[PDB]
Input
Amino acid sequence: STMILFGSTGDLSQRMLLPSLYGLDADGLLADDLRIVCTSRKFLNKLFYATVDITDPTQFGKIADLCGPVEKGIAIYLSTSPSLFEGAIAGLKQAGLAGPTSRLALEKPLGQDLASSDHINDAVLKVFSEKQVYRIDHYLGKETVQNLLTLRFGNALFEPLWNSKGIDHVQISVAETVGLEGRIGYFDSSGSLRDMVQSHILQLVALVAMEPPAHMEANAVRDEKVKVFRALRPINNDTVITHTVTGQYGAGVSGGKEVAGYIDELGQPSDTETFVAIKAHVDNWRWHGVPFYIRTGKRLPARRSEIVVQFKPVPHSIFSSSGGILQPNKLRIVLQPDETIQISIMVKEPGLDRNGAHMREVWLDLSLTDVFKDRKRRIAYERLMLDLIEGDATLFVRRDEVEAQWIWIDGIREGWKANSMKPKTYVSGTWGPITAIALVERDGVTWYDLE
Amino acid sequence: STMILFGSTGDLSQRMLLPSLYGLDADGLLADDLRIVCTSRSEYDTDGFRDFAEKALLNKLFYATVDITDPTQFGKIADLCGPVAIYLSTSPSLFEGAIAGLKQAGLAGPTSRLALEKPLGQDLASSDHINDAVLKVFSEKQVYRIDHYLGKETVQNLLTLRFGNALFEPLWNSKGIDHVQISVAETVGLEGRIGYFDSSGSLRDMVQSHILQLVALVAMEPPAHMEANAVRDEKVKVFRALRPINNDTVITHTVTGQYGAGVSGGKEVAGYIDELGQPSDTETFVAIKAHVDNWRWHGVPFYIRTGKRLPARRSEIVVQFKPVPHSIFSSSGGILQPNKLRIVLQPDETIQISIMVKEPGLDRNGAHMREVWLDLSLTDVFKDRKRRIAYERLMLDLIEGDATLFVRRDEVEAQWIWIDGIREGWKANSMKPKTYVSGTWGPITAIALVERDGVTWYDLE
Amino acid sequence: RLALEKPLGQDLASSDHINDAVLKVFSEKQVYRIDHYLGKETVQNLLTLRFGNALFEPLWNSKGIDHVQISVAETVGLEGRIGYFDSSGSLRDMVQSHILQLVALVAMEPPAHMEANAVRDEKVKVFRALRPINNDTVITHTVTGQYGAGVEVAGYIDELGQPSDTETFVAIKAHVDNWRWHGVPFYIRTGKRLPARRSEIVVQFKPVPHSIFSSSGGILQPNKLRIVLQPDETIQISIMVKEPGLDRNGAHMREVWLDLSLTDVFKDRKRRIAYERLMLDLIEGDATLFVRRDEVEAQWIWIDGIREGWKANSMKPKTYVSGTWGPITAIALVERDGVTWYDLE
Amino acid sequence: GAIAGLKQAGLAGPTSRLALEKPLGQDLASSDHINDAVLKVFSEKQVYRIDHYLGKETVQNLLTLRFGNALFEPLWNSKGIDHVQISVAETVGLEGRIGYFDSSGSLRDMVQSHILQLVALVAMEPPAHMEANAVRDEKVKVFRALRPINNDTVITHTVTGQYGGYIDELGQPSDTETFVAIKAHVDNWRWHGVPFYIRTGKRLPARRSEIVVQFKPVPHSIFSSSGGILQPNKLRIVLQPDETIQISIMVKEPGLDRNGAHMREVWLDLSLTDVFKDRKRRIAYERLMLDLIEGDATLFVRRDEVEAQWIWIDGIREGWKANSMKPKTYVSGTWGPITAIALVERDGVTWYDLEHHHHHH
Output
């Protein structure tokens, strides 16, 4: 019933960040009892400003403030620089609101490293149990991401093929046209690996690589996802160079306006990625030998996040009439900005005989964006928010998840920190550095785009 | 290398060329050794025919005429071009005399190639008797029997679709598919065919040849390589494997319908008996539930329906796929319709697949979903290609080689054994046909045929 | 480190009061529960049979297995320290813990790597996938009995005096309801004073889809994989072979068995009573042969839910004379389904 | 041929049929020349070709094991199995018909039909219903799915040998193989991608003809620890003169903290001969006489099988006479020429031998 930010009068919060809070319930969903406690340097009535500062210790005892009943729960995000979190953690203690089920919502980066994340979580845990913790991951709230569960197990056509023999490899790519998210100097703090790959891509891979549960339970869903992250192939300095590629936002023509370089955008020489590509494997016994080719970067030629499952070829082209070449089957799922799923099959080409059979590849296409046009375009936060209020919530992260996510992340970065692996530049609007072609082409693979 | 032609005057041969010719007079595909041979009961010359031919279309035309009782206008073909295949479309009475002349001319040979479009049978006795007179004169290597469905391009892609894709083969077995459905629908009543249909019946007209050929295409095992002989041998196996329909199963597995007088195209249409002017028990519609017993196909029902005066004209092959082993969306709110693959072969050429998808919205109570169809349209993709007219590649097959499209004896021998066994069985039970209203999809008892075991009927409704 | 004995609980309230009072002092990592069954070599190889091999998995689902049979039969009684049966019956001792563990090691999915929680989590998922027999399902899906007087023996009551309403015999038709197993009845059976002692699992596979030879003499007997854990340690498979004979009337076939007896080769293995390894686990590492708090929860929930149904149906066991191979009524819980209790016959 | 007696005695007639057990061919033309001459008087129904090995009882059981059970076929696919190995070895000198043995080889005698039909009963699909030509019809497609060993593949896909000697017993310049090794390939959906290892010979120190089917490896090894290695699981079959069939499984070897976790490769063993010892113990030729009269027999080879046998037999012979290959003497009991071991040992495969008598320390 309350959310805390110390910078609202200042910087981004003052101009664009706040409406996310006001807009989502102002005409959308329904809310009536809430007590937004804000502090900085319907429910319109609830919002109320306050002032707080970590530097004076005696100040924390003085604020002594709690809006709403103790039997409600204390959710808050401390968006401060490192070492200021510890000073202001106790403020809810002056309120004292830890006893009731507490939402403890954390839509946050959660730190650069597992020790960095654990430091946070160990301190948060003493006031609140895991059941109280409700960490949001913005993709898990996207509807297009949610249907990955109906897709495999609400249909009998897929699961026979999710097993190494069925799939030769899978390709995932999160595409963004612009690097101007207002994160410059904040991106430097993390970067595309921790910014995008550590949870949102990993959460998607978990939806793709897992086993089905027996039923749609909250904790049955999450307990099977940690298994993929614990079954990831750990990328070591001995494997990072072959399996990883970093690239950086350069100066090209992007979006119609010509644009400039990352380093020249920060003003100082910068080393973060703004693009990365990995060749992962799941060793659960259903995925051994199946490469997942993951990719994300900014200043790319299109913003379009899609998954492409390429299946193993037929054991035999019985149409080896000199026209018998069969293009592997692809299951293509597009989740942003258009909602789309398609399959690629072979069909005899209308015609006679040129001393063989000639055929074409073609796509059975279905688009959710068009099929459901009279339906809603609800924001992820609107679906996610009710679950916070609801006694058991399903779309929120768990410690085993993040802890298994970071281990793979920290093992990779040291691998190229121990290998001294600098990024490679790309022209904004090019699809990235030229080294990501060999990374797949050394395996025979091609990255799916338009024709 | 060489082809001779018969029955030039009749509205059958000329009709197919009209639409094709206007689009194409250009192709000139045939090899030089072949030339236009025209024979009909006509007095137009060689020149004088190339004048009638031009309306259908002079460089390759040779004419000359014959008589149907005189084996003497038979030398006129002999006094015609012949360097160091034939098409006969006649009624039953002239069949052996027409064969008689070819032997006297010498135009009957191991070199000679035979093509036989007209109905070739009613029993084994016929099948064997009609073929055996041809067979003593000719071998299988010279006889190539036409099947008017087998040539449709949508049917040719059934081999590419099934065997050019690996997404179909893991589930193309008894465990993968709950049931297989084939439907051919005709809005039109027979027009001008009465007295020909009554002797054949609906089952002889469509089920014996085209529908059975389609059943094999879904059920046939793949050949090691695609050659007419390798592909055909597997198809014959499907006909041999088909479970025999006998008196015990005939009443349960077969429904027969005769079209009544109701309405077609917004106007009342008369009953089949009324058009004949004679009482008939012949069938204008048939429905069957059929099983092919094989390690791959044992226990999977295949249901075949073809009808006359049915509500719409379309031919569709729908293969339902087994329901998911567990509904992980239990506790209510989730219904998981099994996956279905629907392919349309008439009148639109189209393939679709059935998938389950969450409905846009929150989980709320239960998981809510819709089934939805991945749809592909074959006619639009090949827009720079031609249209639905046919009898095409079959020609190239003549000068170049053996034809996958043409029929062989063991199949026709296997078709009638299954088809003849059904007719005697409903003769021993005295199965009178059931009437239906023209445009209702057939007699309503054919609905129990599917509905008593849990099956329904696909409509885009 | 604290290790607990076999009599942990008699119901939900018990094992949750006894544990959450101890889990108030200790934790799940430092807590070990004792299953006498788990630590046996023949049980240990079940996971080694399934997942160290590739021959079985292609069929280990509702599309390759017809039925499983798990039997543990005894000749003795409970002499020396009777009281637990009076307190718990024959349900809570051997089924709630011992045989349910044998149920888990056959109907579970593989972990990525052999580690305690990763292996245990797959078993917990089974005990959650157990279809709960409740209400008016326990009469037609369960059979109870009591060993009578016969063979000098006297009955249980005809040796104890007081009237009790608890069975020394239970028959269930269990059901794991997951993608892998939906549709596969699991047949669990145990009891005392029966004419044999051999604990064994039997997995009957479905019949081949079509029979080429089934016209005359075509009796196609299904293939069954046989495993014997107690007291014989024996794994076999039933296969169909041609009868060498000059036959003029159809195909002649015999059901024969690929036989394997592991003790005969496992002599070098220092065969010993099961408990000797269990101590080292507690002494030097993570407990893989021990039950977990979530394992106890899903066991008792499915163990107690039946008790709801038969005390409301006021269900009483059915007398079998000792040596009646059980009550004759456990023969119809399968004969109504066509299946019959297997025997080497 | 001297069949000329029968037709010029009025004997080639419908009352009576024929079964042939003669050295019919050395090439496709000779059997067809024999066949065309016999089919010049008869048709295939009254023309029967006899293969001794088909007629052995334990050989008869190959398809019933394949098709009376549901455990194998799920794996009888390229995905299911890695490779097949067929071995037929003899103890005798090549002297039983030493002059006759020269000019036919061990290929056209033993492999062209006997072991190729052992190939046929392995790489076939099930027919509709058992019928005399239904069995044959699925073997023809096998004999058609046999990759024709190329003159470019005959160096890396074949190995020949000689009794060490055959020259020292026959006189004339001899290039005759007292041993043969090939690696065949069935190119159908079910089988494309599976090495078929065929091996036979006469100057070897053992006599037990056997088939071995190795199934593919597991995707993931959950039990990753020291000591525990996994040999792939295999099917072993021995029919003559021993009838002994086993399966390779991985079973735990009990130990406490000794050399890590322990797993043994042990065998489910079954011998038909002990079970049926009270039974016939007949001669492979016994029933074949009853099938011919008033009947359609399943157990006879057909001209297209022998034709497709010969076509695949001749395609090698041109090619290895084109590579000018000569046999390699092996000194009287070395399990073959030293080169047939690399035909697998380079491919990772090793020639399978009984674990007892194959191990040391």
